[PDB]
Amino acid sequence: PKRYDLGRVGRYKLNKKLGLNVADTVRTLTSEDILAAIDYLINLELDLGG
Amino acid sequence: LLPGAEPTVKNGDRVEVGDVLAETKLTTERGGTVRMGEDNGSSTHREVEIITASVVLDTATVKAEASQGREHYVIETKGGQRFNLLAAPGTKVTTGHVVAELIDSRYRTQTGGLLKYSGVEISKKGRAKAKQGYEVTKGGTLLWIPEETHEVNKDISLLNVEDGQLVEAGTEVVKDIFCQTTGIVSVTQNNDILREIVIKPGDVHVLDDPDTAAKYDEGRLVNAGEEVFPGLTAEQLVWAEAVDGTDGPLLLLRPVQELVIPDEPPVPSQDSSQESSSRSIRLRAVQRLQFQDGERIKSVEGVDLLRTQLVLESEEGSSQLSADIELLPDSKDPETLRLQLVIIEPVVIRRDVASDTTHGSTHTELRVKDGQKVKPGAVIACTQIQCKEAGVVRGIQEGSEAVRRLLVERERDCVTLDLDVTAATQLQPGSLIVAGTQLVDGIIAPESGEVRAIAPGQLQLRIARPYRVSQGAVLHVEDKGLVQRGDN
């Protein structure tokens, strides 16, 4: 937490897009975020429609 | 049908809500009857394995105290001795690890016996490449040399030695009391250099014939029974040392102390139910040889010579781990501790989904998933798909294992309209009509669809939608394919 910062807006946008419920005081990348991003990529490739 | 279940319904079959559509074939080796092998919080024995051989050894009750160290306690094994449990979970044990060592308190060879190449007997074994030294089943007879001669280079510049004849305790071992009553070593030297210095107390035996005596023929040839002269003291032994060192022909009478070896120790019962695919996970009775020159410490300090280690080659190609399971050992009915050595047989299971507009409902099948005894094929399949409406089944194809979607034609997919009589020969079943068109002299077609059943007063259609494809486009779908909403 000295060379990487997400910000309140960044955390809020990540939660809104990927449908997570991480607390608002966390401003660093986690493993759940990466897993959800890869899951969203895979679902987008296979034409979910949502 | 994303998971890959084979369909159970075929074309032209009427189905009601709750009827299955497809099932999987999740099978593994040794399927059969469960015999109390339930998993996932169902039976008391949650941990489920091969349950075909069940290699188990009993009479291994141990405690869990935190006294006399951190995990040191007396174990009442078959031999009634403290067995070192050096193979603990989380310690990253290896195959053939050093765990078979016992406690060596008073039967440890202090001076020990060096390795020779004089009278070793071999039949099929040797020391070629990496054989971990000379392993012998009969047991080679090696001479026990009690030589406490070490290269302790004392500083003669400060502690000069006048005579040093009384070599009993030592020169500067700790402060005053070296080994016994005060005795100063003679610090034997050489021509401008030093040599081997005898530290053992020894005895004055300058009498006659140290190495060329009557008993000393063809090397040493020390006999326990016969003495150097008929009538000598044979209270304990008459073994002597050939090496004298310095200070004349000092015989250095050294009795040899050996292990008791009263009889054969009770061999542990190591024959469990090894009838399933030759699965034997047991310990051997070999000791090998792990101290030739450098592994053995060449100093006054002594360690456990001839380290106890058994080499395991059971189930070659799968003995790389050999850790089995080190979970909390308890018996079946009681909680008596044991040492279980069963191989892990993990089982993979999934969960169920409720329903969705894309895929059907998934429910746990009442199959024989709980069964694995002998035969290949465990049928642990628990996936089922149920309908949500009533209709006819379509979409089955003759393609080999290329079925990923199903179609159900319900009642809302058809439209019955009473417009007029067709009175035409161009309205055979399967005809396609596109919206407003001139079918008969009057009444245009209100909707577009596929003709199903014509009547003198009614007409039946299947709801359909056309799209225009221009020449040169790229096609992403096949002729008799199935698509979902929003597909390109």
Side-chain angles (χ1 to χ4, degrees), chain B residues 437-468:
Chain B
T437 191
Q438 207 62 68
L439 291 173
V440 83
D441 172 63
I443 174 70
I444 42 58
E447 331 296 331
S448 47
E450 178 145 63
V451 188
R452 171 82 100 221
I454 77 184
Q458 275 68 253
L459 190 53
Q460 231 191 338
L461 297 171
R462 177 149 174 223
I463 310 183
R465 174 80 148 77
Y467 294 85
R468 176 83 200 172

Side-chain angles (χ1 to χ4, degrees), chain A residues 46-50, chain B residues 358 485-488:
Chain A
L46 291 190
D47 230 340
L48 166 59
Chain B
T358 36
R485 185 199 234 272
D487 258 355
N488 276 331

Side-chain angles (χ1 to χ4, degrees), chain B residues 415-457:
Chain B
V415 154
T416 291
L417 22 86
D418 43 337
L419 300 168
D420 220 295
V421 78
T422 280
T425 183
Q426 300 88 346
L427 251 267
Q428 34 269 52
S431 280
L432 290 160
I433 47 152
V434 39
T437 191
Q438 207 62 68
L439 291 173
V440 83
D441 172 63
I443 174 70
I444 42 58
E447 331 296 331
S448 47
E450 178 145 63
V451 188
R452 171 82 100 221
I454 77 184

Side-chain angles (χ1 to χ4, degrees), chain B residues 1-3 18-22 351-363 383-389 404-406 408 484:
Chain B
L1 322 168
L2 235 295
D19 230 315
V20 301
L21 290 160
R351 220 165 183 79
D352 286 2
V353 201
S355 52
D356 181 29
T357 201
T358 36
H359 38 63
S361 49
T362 294
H363 324 102
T383 87
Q384 291 272 45
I385 296 118
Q386 291 196 348
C387 307
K388 350 184 194 79
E389 289 252 33
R404 333 281 290 101
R405 292 172 168 102
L406 292 182
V408 169
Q484 293 249 36

Side-chain angles (χ1 to χ4, degrees), chain B residues 134-156:
Chain B
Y134 271 2
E135 183 265 320
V136 58
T137 66
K138 197 56 81 145
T141 38
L142 290 156
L143 194 180
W144 209 55
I145 283 87
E147 214 195 319
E148 196 102 84
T149 300
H150 310 281
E151 280 65 79
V152 281
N153 309 17
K154 265 88 62 192
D155 289 320
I156 341 120

